[PDB]
Amino acid sequence: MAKSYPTVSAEYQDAVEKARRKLRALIAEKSCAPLMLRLAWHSAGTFDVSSKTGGPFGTMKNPAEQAHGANAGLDIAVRMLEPVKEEFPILSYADLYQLAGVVAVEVTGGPEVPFHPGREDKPQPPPEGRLPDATKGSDHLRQVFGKQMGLSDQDIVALSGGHTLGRAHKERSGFEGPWTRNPLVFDNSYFKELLSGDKEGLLQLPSDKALLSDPVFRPLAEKYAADEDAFFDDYKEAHLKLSELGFADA
Ligand code: HEM
Ligand code: NA
């Protein structure tokens, strides 16, 4: 609910901007924005507010966190981004993975998520099992996002909009296919596909369905389905809170 951002060195700021450009060109070229967003998201979602452990602090680099079940396939993102670290080694992995999320969203047409650099790489990855269970429901979402992460009900619907990008893969999570007809375009189509019900060739996890069966989550999804500026605004807000969990507080 309050931040005090470090002023990083001119050289770090220059690294960040150089990296941002390189991420644009890497991402746009290899069309892997969605997996990049997933890396940022999974790097940050592990934060627990009561224990002040986990969160966007580079730990996704430790091949132990890449071995967490929930994280199958992030090792591809981590290897894809290493050249970027090779050229700007002063950057932390913490910063580099969140900047990739931000750049993913912006390249695919989505809102401008501000970026405040300065995350340190911590040494101890969080414990496995903090991220949300795709087969679970509305109250689980509040346990993960709400009680552990400290985000709000609005953050949950808006953020669940990240599934406007990309798809599931059988070898990673078990589920298969995309949520939307245009998986390389950041728009509000995800909430439109939800409210439309199940259909062939499009995925819907039970955690997706949870948003339609809840009096708070339901109208938010309706709003975002109808109003893409509303969605882009709230998403921008939530993505930014997500990207700084435990970072630069007070
Ligand atoms: C309850 C919350 C969530 C659940 C249960 C969940 C679960 C999943 C699952 C099972 C996949 C498919 C993985 C695979 O086999 O490739 C996936 C993909 C993805 N998730 Fe979520 N996720 C959640 C929240 C989020 C959030 C908050 C974001 C971003 C802000 C996000 C971004 C993505 C993206 C971009 C992909 C596509 C990856 C690709 O195309 O390779 N997810 N998610
Ligand atoms: Na889309």
Residue numbers in the entry: 1 to 250
Text of the article:
Thus, to assist crystallization, site-directed mutagenesis was conducted on the specific residues that are common in the existing APX crystal structures, but not seen in PviAPX. Three mutations, C4S, C168A and K229D were selected, which are far from both the heme-binding and ligand-binding pockets. In addition, the construct contained two conservative mutations, E14D and V221A, that were part of the cloned recombinant PviAPX. The electron density of the apo-form PviAPX revealed a metal ion from the early stages of the refinement which was located at the distal side and positioned 13 Å from heme iron. An Na+ ion was placed, since this was the only cation present in our final purification step and crystallization procedures. The Na+ ion was coordinated by the sidechains of Thr-164, Thr-180, Asn-182, Val-185 and Asp-187, all of which are conserved among APXs. Consistent with the spectral signals of the purified mutant and wild-type PviAPX, the apo-form crystal structure showed what was presumably the resting ferric state (Fe(III)). A bound but non-coordinating water molecule was positioned distal to the heme at a distance of 2.2 Å from the iron, which was similar to the observed ferric heme species in rsAPX. The Ne atom of His-42 on the distal side was hydrogen bonded to a water molecule, which in turn hydrogen bonded to the heme-bound water molecule. To further investigate the binding preference of phenylpropanoids, molecular docking was performed with the structural coordinates of the apo-form PviAPX.
